[PDB]
Assembly symmetry: D2
Homo-oligomer: 220 residues x 4
Amino acid sequence: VIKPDMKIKLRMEGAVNGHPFAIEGVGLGKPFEGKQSMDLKVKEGGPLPFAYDILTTVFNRVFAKYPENIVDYFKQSFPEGYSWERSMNYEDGGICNATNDITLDGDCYIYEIRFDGVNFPANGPVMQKRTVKWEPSTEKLYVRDGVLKGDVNTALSLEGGGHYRCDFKTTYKAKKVVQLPDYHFVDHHIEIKSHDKDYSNVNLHEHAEAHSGLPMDELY
Amino acid sequence: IKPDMKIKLRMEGAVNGHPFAIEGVGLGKPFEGKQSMDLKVKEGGPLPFAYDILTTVFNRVFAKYPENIVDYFKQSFPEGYSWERSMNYEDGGICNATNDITLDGDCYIYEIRFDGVNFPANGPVMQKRTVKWEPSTEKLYVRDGVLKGDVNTALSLEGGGHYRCDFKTTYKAKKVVQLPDYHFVDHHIEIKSHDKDYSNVNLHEHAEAHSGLPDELY
Amino acid sequence: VIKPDMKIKLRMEGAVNGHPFAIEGVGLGKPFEGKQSMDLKVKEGGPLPFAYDILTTVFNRVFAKYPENIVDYFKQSFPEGYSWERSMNYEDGGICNATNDITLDGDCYIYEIRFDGVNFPANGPVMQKRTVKWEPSTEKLYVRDGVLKGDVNTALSLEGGGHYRCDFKTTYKAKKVVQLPDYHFVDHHIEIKSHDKDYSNVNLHEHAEAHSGLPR
Amino acid sequence: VIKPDMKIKLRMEGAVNGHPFAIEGVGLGKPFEGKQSMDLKVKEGGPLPFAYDILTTVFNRVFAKYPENIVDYFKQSFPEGYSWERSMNYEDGGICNATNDITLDGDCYIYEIRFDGVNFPANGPVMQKRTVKWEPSTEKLYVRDGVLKGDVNTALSLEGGGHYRCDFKTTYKAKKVVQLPDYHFVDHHIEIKSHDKDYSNVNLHEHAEAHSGLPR
């Protein structure tokens, strides 16, 4: 069901502060190494008047390196796939709601994404594009009511030095009955590796690895 | 804007990733702060979530403002205004909504988007255990050249008790209008009739602005 | 059990950002009018290095004018009295936890108050003492699990124009079994009407009236 | 200034839902290994009517294994020491505010701790004592306005299976000017390894290591 090399195709439709936009992307990754890359192009609503960073973690936890001792909720869910919903609550009150319906077509994952952010102040780092990148993160994942949740408090680094904080709450919903994991973590590091001046073209990379917290490197 | 105004709207949105669409027509008295409308589900019916989460998204021009409080909303017309809102429920369900309000003759026209996520399957929204919104008192204050609206309100539940929700609204006039001081708007929104699956809903709202704790028999 | 004219007596012990202080107060009020006033004196930790405004709503909903049609949880609770707990979550991350144990001795209410605030940033309006007053407010009150709850997002007005937000969460607990009210509101207006330069002496007033919202 | 083997002595005074208590502890740890253990004794307010787990994070980031490439804010701050403030916001509205004034006397760290929790519902896992342990955690540390912050969203596992989440906001403040670190992480694992029936006596352990997350 999951090959060492998989493809990605996606379409996001959404709006920020009431202004609509759409983005499509194609990409590739290796689910068992927890790495992926994709090229994104803005199809509608460009040039985007907000920080592109708010979108990137919406652009698939199957792309995470899961060790044998931790149950893989995401790799189990295919070929049927899974969906997820998320609220991203920034410290100045800007809040983004996002959904992704992930299906599988051959060796290609297909994402149907919706993205809606509101209440970003005009003078804030998002509407003024003062973000540099997301810091690496450690998400915490746990079962509630038969599905998997993901909470993480992370931050964006800012232009003039400093960090802009954001609280993530994600619900992951397998479409099939799968085995549920215990409490565990996923480290992330997402990076924009190239882009043009107004971000109509973006090359996006992510590396993610699951673990169980403070413990195996016993020199043997 | 006349004593009798019309309302015409369309909402497109999704809840927990499930899309839907609703259209509505209505009428109101902006200076008396009263309005009513008939709503029809066009797509995604029957809705699998509590209809109440939508009602406060379905126009502060319909609020009775005393002369001593600057009316941000009536000033903004004929150009109109837009607003954005997050509604944060106490079990983590969160709904984001926007409304672009324009004016065509005597009819206000709304373009509405609504997106809710993370409503638990066993919660009062997905199980349709809400009864109504309680009356509320919103607080409005200027920030960064625009008007904000905060209110922590609640829905009454079927088996008793209340389900909380924190509202954060930003109101944005499309033209330069005069800015009010800190003030309040009392609300009471009510569904007065509906059919079995809420495909048809008659919705009413009464709203009055005031200045908090200050009729002296004269 | 509650007279038209009652007195107030209190002591607050607490800390803000780890710096301790203590304040005592004496006052008077009219419970059926929803009005009260008191004189507060800093006994320890002066001169206070934080905005005095963060303390004032901590300095008794018995001082609220309740109409006949709304159940009065607080006047019912006496002579045994009641207690309350509260979290005050300001929009920049400063957070104050407070409790009040209210008893009655003759015609005087006695408050035992604890107050603890943390994470107020050095450059914020509280530590820089740039607050003017609390705005008038409308608290929302509702029953949850047999006790009375009070929620309200209110604000402090700032010196150069502007407002500093705060989300209140209060739990009211009668010491005896009393009758529970329906969902209702309490309008507030608290004001510092006089103070000395470093707020070691403060005259504080409050006016409060309960109601049920629109239509009335 | 900082040896491989250090001792701990502390006193916590506090209250939860208005009911006060006091606890003293003595312990030892290895700052460069990020490990510590201590014995805690309830002196006042026992038997504690709330889940002991809510207090364990409050019972010193100097006990964290820092790699050379990450600036160590806490080991730098001594012998003068540092203080911290923290808000712990539980998902059912219970909120605990805590402070620690950490000083050093010879080879012993001395803590002066205050702890105040409010709004824990009567039927919740804290008041009903249905907590098992804190899960392992990863704290995020970053500078803001010249001091060090620590944010982390963790959880307590519950008796019958499940988790009760909590939002952790800490400010770390050195008593002297020390050098500021970049954005980094601290992995934790705190565990109660033994206790008597009503937690009058508690043996508490913590293991902590700093790191920089997944690389670029």
